[PDB]
Design a protein around this ligand. Sequence first.
Ligand SMILES: [Ca+2]
Lengths: 314, 328
Amino acid sequence: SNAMKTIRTQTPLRLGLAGGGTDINLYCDKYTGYVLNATISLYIHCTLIKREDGKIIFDSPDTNSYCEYESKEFLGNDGKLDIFKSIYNRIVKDFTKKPLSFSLHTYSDVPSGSGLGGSSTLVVGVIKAFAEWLNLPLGEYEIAKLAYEIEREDLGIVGGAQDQYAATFGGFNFMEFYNNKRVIVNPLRIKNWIASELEARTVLYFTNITSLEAMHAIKQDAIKMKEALFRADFGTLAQILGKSWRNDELERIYKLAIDNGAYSGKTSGAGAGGFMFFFVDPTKKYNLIKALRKEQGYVQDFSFTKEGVKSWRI
Amino acid sequence: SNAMKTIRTQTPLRLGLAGGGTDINLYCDKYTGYVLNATISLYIHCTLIKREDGKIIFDSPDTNSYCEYESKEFLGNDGKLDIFKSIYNRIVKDFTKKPLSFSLHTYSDVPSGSGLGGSSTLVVGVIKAFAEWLNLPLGEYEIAKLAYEIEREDLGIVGGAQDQYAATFGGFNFMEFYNNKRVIVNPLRIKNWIASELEARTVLYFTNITREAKSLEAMHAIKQDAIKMKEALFRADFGTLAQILGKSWRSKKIISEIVSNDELERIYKLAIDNGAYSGKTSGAGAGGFMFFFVDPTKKYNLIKALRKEQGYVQDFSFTKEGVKSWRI
Ligand SMILES: [Ca+2]
């Protein structure tokens, strides 16, 4: 039937829906913030193929990067796909203890610099390919953690492994922070129609153009959003999501969207050439999209996904 | 809180993955042929809002059409969205026995003319909106029948309720035809990775082309290809599945539709040059499309070459569900 020497993984990107931060500790319990994100149907795809010629190949055509090295236990940096070397180097140090021969191929559904957690989604996607291929004893949590440490070695990170949790666990996740280091992830069960209604009121547009009283009400905003989520209260949810969102080329298109129905708008990234996310009445969604198609950027349809990284062998 | 006087429905379009025809007494079963289709993440969206002013509004902006009438039992035809009148008229004749007041708003994720089951998908989404709103005793099969009756009678389609069952039931459906009458629908339970693997191997491209001035025994192996394709699906045998899909795609009606046009033939060529190893052209009309099979490690470069052409690549997933609805 199948040769079974090929592994593939598919890892979704995510949208920050809301968030509050108090990097400065003050609460009686050391609460430093919250984020509500949700994975969407835009992915990073990886394919890993076993080889037998003692070669290692890293192929990432969406970044115009291709590498071929001789198989060995440690790959030194050469400024090309160094993130792949760190991952490989770690897998060998911690689990296999010997070199491997294979080809790794990857691409993203969105151009580089989109701000949907692409760097972490990739790392997670690639680690899962190795884990599935090598039968490594690593649960979803251990994967997100390993992804965080690898990213930490090559660059500095704040907010803990939140992006890695989104990519690994998927769905809507409500994250609570303590001492700007500890992260408590609440993977939420959201009724399907809630996601469906949110999708019906949403437009995602890529632009293609690369105080203290507020801080102290953050915890209560969180309780209110969570409360609105389990009650499936859209009035409130829409009321607080719109709030959480309260000169450039971005401001012109924001104006253009509101003049065509959008009642709320938000950017993120890389807050410039990334994307704009709008809320609109579904009976107005089509006209809005038609207007935006006329501009420089493009509208990207998507749905919220229920799961995180998946993998399979063929 | 929520007002609860609004109903929304979302209905997926479908993709014909494979099919074959055998007419008719070639078998002692009266096996007409088969079709294997699967719903995808491109949808028709419907919103139905109750209003208390004796008005009936039909709003379809993707087709630049807007109708307004007075609430009554029967709405005669006038050339603007006559499809919604037939649906409305039938809901009143067979269920409510009285006039209704509401506004109906719809739109599709794909342009007019596409060969993805657009008409059946629309009728199903609307019927479902009324059923949910009025609490009609209608299961999914009953909605597909109603959709089929309305579509054959008040239009002129023939060939079976294929498209209505796909939109209503969703997922992968293998349909067998007997004596051009009995459609046996096998709603397949498919391992999720099969779907994921198929998605990894495929590219959907809308052409935006406008054409200009440029067997007697092999047909008997069709019923064999069907049982072979079911077995491969059940077995999750992707090596054999790719192989059999590959075959049915080289018929005559596929290769003819490709070659019968210089610009489509050029696009096919360009796709094979860039990684595709198989493709078909469907509903080659106002908004035709090509569907390709490609090596996943080559898909990005294929997509990249296609994005430089006048058409556009449409990402999608295979979906598990058929029509869904909710009240808000
Ligand atoms: Ca490193």
